[PDB]
Design an enzyme around this catalytic site. Structure first.
Site, PDB file in Angstrom:
ATOM      1  N   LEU A  22      23.927  53.179  66.350  1.00  0.00           N
ATOM      2  CA  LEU A  22      23.766  52.699  67.764  1.00  0.00           C
ATOM      3  C   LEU A  22      22.887  53.710  68.557  1.00  0.00           C
ATOM      4  O   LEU A  22      22.754  54.867  68.146  1.00  0.00           O
ATOM      5  CB  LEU A  22      25.187  52.484  68.354  1.00  0.00           C
ATOM      6  CG  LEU A  22      26.105  51.561  67.523  1.00  0.00           C
ATOM      7  CD1 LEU A  22      27.512  51.299  68.041  1.00  0.00           C
ATOM      8  CD2 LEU A  22      25.494  50.209  67.338  1.00  0.00           C
ATOM      9  N   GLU A  30      34.691  50.314  73.141  1.00  0.00           N
ATOM     10  CA  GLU A  30      33.689  49.231  72.891  1.00  0.00           C
ATOM     11  C   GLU A  30      33.923  48.715  71.485  1.00  0.00           C
ATOM     12  O   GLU A  30      33.991  47.483  71.230  1.00  0.00           O
ATOM     13  CB  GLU A  30      32.225  49.683  73.161  1.00  0.00           C
ATOM     14  CG  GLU A  30      31.275  48.569  73.627  1.00  0.00           C
ATOM     15  CD  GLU A  30      30.897  47.580  72.545  1.00  0.00           C
ATOM     16  OE1 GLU A  30      30.937  46.390  72.900  1.00  0.00           O
ATOM     17  OE2 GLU A  30      30.659  47.969  71.353  1.00  0.00           O
TER      18      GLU A  30
HETATM   19  N1  LIG Z   1      25.709  45.426  68.957  1.00  0.00           N
HETATM   20  C1  LIG Z   1      24.919  46.360  68.570  1.00  0.00           C
HETATM   21  O1  LIG Z   1      24.497  47.242  69.393  1.00  0.00           O
HETATM   22  C2  LIG Z   1      24.568  46.273  67.207  1.00  0.00           C
HETATM   23  C3  LIG Z   1      23.734  47.216  66.669  1.00  0.00           C
HETATM   24  N2  LIG Z   1      23.326  47.169  65.348  1.00  0.00           N
HETATM   25  C4  LIG Z   1      22.342  48.215  64.954  1.00  0.00           C
HETATM   26  O2  LIG Z   1      21.086  47.460  64.987  1.00  0.00           O
HETATM   27  C5  LIG Z   1      20.288  47.793  63.812  1.00  0.00           C
HETATM   28  C6  LIG Z   1      20.333  46.493  62.880  1.00  0.00           C
HETATM   29  O3  LIG Z   1      19.026  46.219  62.539  1.00  0.00           O
HETATM   30  P1  LIG Z   1      18.240  45.086  62.131  1.00  0.00           P
HETATM   31  O4  LIG Z   1      17.047  45.797  61.642  1.00  0.00           O
HETATM   32  O5  LIG Z   1      18.029  44.041  63.180  1.00  0.00           O
HETATM   33  O6  LIG Z   1      18.911  44.589  60.796  1.00  0.00           O
HETATM   34  P2  LIG Z   1      19.773  43.370  60.110  1.00  0.00           P
HETATM   35  O7  LIG Z   1      21.156  43.728  60.146  1.00  0.00           O
HETATM   36  O8  LIG Z   1      19.333  42.045  60.723  1.00  0.00           O
HETATM   37  O9  LIG Z   1      19.266  43.497  58.633  1.00  0.00           O
HETATM   38  C7  LIG Z   1      17.939  43.089  58.296  1.00  0.00           C
HETATM   39  C8  LIG Z   1      17.929  42.720  56.810  1.00  0.00           C
HETATM   40  O10 LIG Z   1      18.915  41.702  56.681  1.00  0.00           O
HETATM   41  C9  LIG Z   1      18.356  40.554  55.887  1.00  0.00           C
HETATM   42  N3  LIG Z   1      18.331  39.502  56.860  1.00  0.00           N
HETATM   43  C10 LIG Z   1      18.288  39.485  58.222  1.00  0.00           C
HETATM   44  N4  LIG Z   1      18.337  38.194  58.617  1.00  0.00           N
HETATM   45  C11 LIG Z   1      18.380  37.409  57.518  1.00  0.00           C
HETATM   46  C12 LIG Z   1      18.420  36.050  57.335  1.00  0.00           C
HETATM   47  N5  LIG Z   1      18.405  35.193  58.416  1.00  0.00           N
HETATM   48  N6  LIG Z   1      18.508  35.542  56.102  1.00  0.00           N
HETATM   49  C13 LIG Z   1      18.509  36.366  54.939  1.00  0.00           C
HETATM   50  N7  LIG Z   1      18.456  37.754  55.136  1.00  0.00           N
HETATM   51  C14 LIG Z   1      18.368  38.212  56.426  1.00  0.00           C
HETATM   52  C15 LIG Z   1      16.999  41.031  55.427  1.00  0.00           C
HETATM   53  O11 LIG Z   1      17.337  41.729  54.215  1.00  0.00           O
HETATM   54  P3  LIG Z   1      16.627  41.461  52.794  1.00  0.00           P
HETATM   55  O12 LIG Z   1      15.333  42.185  53.063  1.00  0.00           O
HETATM   56  O13 LIG Z   1      17.438  42.063  51.736  1.00  0.00           O
HETATM   57  O14 LIG Z   1      16.240  39.939  52.715  1.00  0.00           O
HETATM   58  C16 LIG Z   1      16.654  42.069  56.516  1.00  0.00           C
HETATM   59  O15 LIG Z   1      15.740  43.057  56.007  1.00  0.00           O
HETATM   60  C17 LIG Z   1      20.910  49.012  63.227  1.00  0.00           C
HETATM   61  O16 LIG Z   1      20.466  50.237  63.890  1.00  0.00           O
HETATM   62  C18 LIG Z   1      22.375  48.780  63.519  1.00  0.00           C
HETATM   63  O17 LIG Z   1      23.135  49.920  63.649  1.00  0.00           O
HETATM   64  C19 LIG Z   1      23.645  46.112  64.444  1.00  0.00           C
HETATM   65  C20 LIG Z   1      24.484  45.100  64.968  1.00  0.00           C
HETATM   66  C21 LIG Z   1      24.903  45.130  66.351  1.00  0.00           C
HETATM   67  C1  LIG Z   2      28.610  45.316  64.758  1.00  0.00           C
HETATM   68  C2  LIG Z   2      29.112  45.988  66.088  1.00  0.00           C
HETATM   69  C3  LIG Z   2      29.704  47.192  65.910  1.00  0.00           C
HETATM   70  S1  LIG Z   2      30.012  48.096  64.242  1.00  0.00           S
HETATM   71  C4  LIG Z   2      28.698  49.231  64.089  1.00  0.00           C
HETATM   72  C5  LIG Z   2      27.380  48.775  64.037  1.00  0.00           C
HETATM   73  C6  LIG Z   2      26.311  49.682  63.886  1.00  0.00           C
HETATM   74  C7  LIG Z   2      26.553  51.068  63.844  1.00  0.00           C
HETATM   75  C8  LIG Z   2      27.875  51.546  63.905  1.00  0.00           C
HETATM   76  C9  LIG Z   2      28.146  52.932  63.828  1.00  0.00           C
HETATM   77  C10 LIG Z   2      29.466  53.408  63.904  1.00  0.00           C
HETATM   78  C11 LIG Z   2      30.519  52.492  64.037  1.00  0.00           C
HETATM   79  C12 LIG Z   2      30.269  51.107  64.075  1.00  0.00           C
HETATM   80  C13 LIG Z   2      28.954  50.627  64.019  1.00  0.00           C
HETATM   81  S2  LIG Z   2      30.171  47.844  67.371  1.00  0.00           S
HETATM   82  C14 LIG Z   2      29.665  46.347  68.268  1.00  0.00           C
HETATM   83  N1  LIG Z   2      29.778  46.098  69.604  1.00  0.00           N
HETATM   84  C15 LIG Z   2      29.379  44.891  70.034  1.00  0.00           C
HETATM   85  N2  LIG Z   2      29.564  44.571  71.309  1.00  0.00           N
HETATM   86  N3  LIG Z   2      28.795  43.979  69.204  1.00  0.00           N
HETATM   87  C16 LIG Z   2      28.617  44.281  67.939  1.00  0.00           C
HETATM   88  N4  LIG Z   2      27.990  43.297  67.186  1.00  0.00           N
HETATM   89  C17 LIG Z   2      29.057  45.481  67.390  1.00  0.00           C
END
Ligand SMILES: NC(=O)C1=CN([C@@H]2O[C@H](COP(=O)(O)OP(=O)(O)OC[C@H]3O[C@@H](n4cnc5c(N)ncnc54)[C@H](OP(=O)(O)O)[C@@H]3O)[C@@H](O)[C@H]2O)C=CC1
Ligand SMILES: Cc1c(Sc2cccc3ccccc23)sc2nc(N)nc(N)c12
EC number: 1.5.1.3
Length: 186
Positions: A22, A30
């Site tokens: 994050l 959160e």
């Molecule tokens: N709420 C928050 O603030 C959240 C934060 N995060 C953070 O955000 C970042 C996540 O990054 P992001 O780069 O968007 O990555 P994703 O989690 O979307 O992963 C991307 C990989 O997932 C596969 N993928 C994604 N979409 C599809 C699809 N529709 N169908 C098939 N495969 C798919 C592909 O892998 P392949 O190449 O193998 O096909 C792609 O390279 C990280 O830093 C993580 O920590 C993540 C979730 C929530």
């Molecule tokens: C996937 C997720 C998370 S889990 C997570 C997602 C990416 C980095 C993390 C690092 C340490 C601990 C948990 C991590 S927190 C969170 N908060 C909201 N509102 N929405 C989300 N989709 C997530």
């Protein structure tokens, strides 16, 4: 199968991730909130499904994987099977959702929660249908390398209250944030 929902936490400049973590230091409540919302199923004898991208999977600490008390599904086209600890693997968002209409899953799944990342969110958000977004607004800018897609406020209405979701501002580690729920139906 009931509701489809996205859940995210996003900084003021739309950031969600940086170098696979994050953008902000950990905000315990959160994570609790995310856990509570995705786990809790409004039916008896069913579980929620969480759908996430491959990079999101591997961003979660090994000790919290799989996300407990939920069916965990990973999206990837490179992997040949679900990762260690995951339950299912799909090649597209459509396939993951088709899979929910299978005999196998049909009657075990309550809510479906898309838990990230950017590309999964964007496709779900632009697809016709009834969809809610649970958005935690982290109330500062943070340097980020992965962003939440635009929320079109013509289609997504910010709900003025929602049960089990706090309306006032929270603060942990000197960072204020707020919970929001948006709904579209198109
Ligand atoms: N709420 C928050 O603030 C959240 C934060 N995060 C953070 O955000 C970042 C996540 O990054 P992001 O780069 O968007 O990555 P994703 O989690 O979307 O992963 C991307 C990989 O997932 C596969 N993928 C994604 N979409 C599809 C699809 N529709 N169908 C098939 N495969 C798919 C592909 O892998 P392949 O190449 O193998 O096909 C792609 O390279 C990280 O830093 C993580 O920590 C993540 C979730 C929530
Ligand atoms: C996937 C997720 C998370 S889990 C997570 C997602 C990416 C980095 C993390 C690092 C340490 C601990 C948990 C991590 S927190 C969170 N908060 C909201 N509102 N929405 C989300 N989709 C997530």
């Amino acid at each position: 199968v009931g509701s489809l929902n996205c859940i995210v936490a996003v900084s003021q400049n739309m950031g969600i991730g940086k170098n696979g973590d994050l953008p902000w230091p950990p905000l315990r409540n959160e994570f609790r909130y995310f856990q509570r919302m995705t786990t809790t199923s409004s039916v008896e004898g069913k579980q929620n499904l969480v759908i996430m991208g491959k990079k999101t999977w591997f961003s979660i600490p090994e000790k919290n994987r799989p996300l407990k008390g939920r069916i965990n599904l990973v999206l990837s086209r490179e992997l040949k099977e679900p990762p260690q600890g995951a339950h299912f693997l799909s090649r597209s968002l459509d396939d993951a959702l088709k899979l929910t209409e299978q005999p196998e899953l049909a009657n075990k799944v309550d809510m479906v929660w898309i838990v990230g990342g950017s590309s999964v969110y964007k496709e779900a958000m632009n697809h016709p249908g009834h969809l809610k977004l649970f958005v935690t607004r982290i109330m500062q800018d943070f340097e980020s390398d992965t962003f939440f897609p635009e929320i079109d406020l013509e289609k997504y209405k910010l709900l003025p209250e929602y049960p089990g979701v706090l309306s006032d501002v929270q603060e942990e580690k000197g960072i204020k944030y707020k919970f929001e729920v948006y709904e579209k139906n198109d």
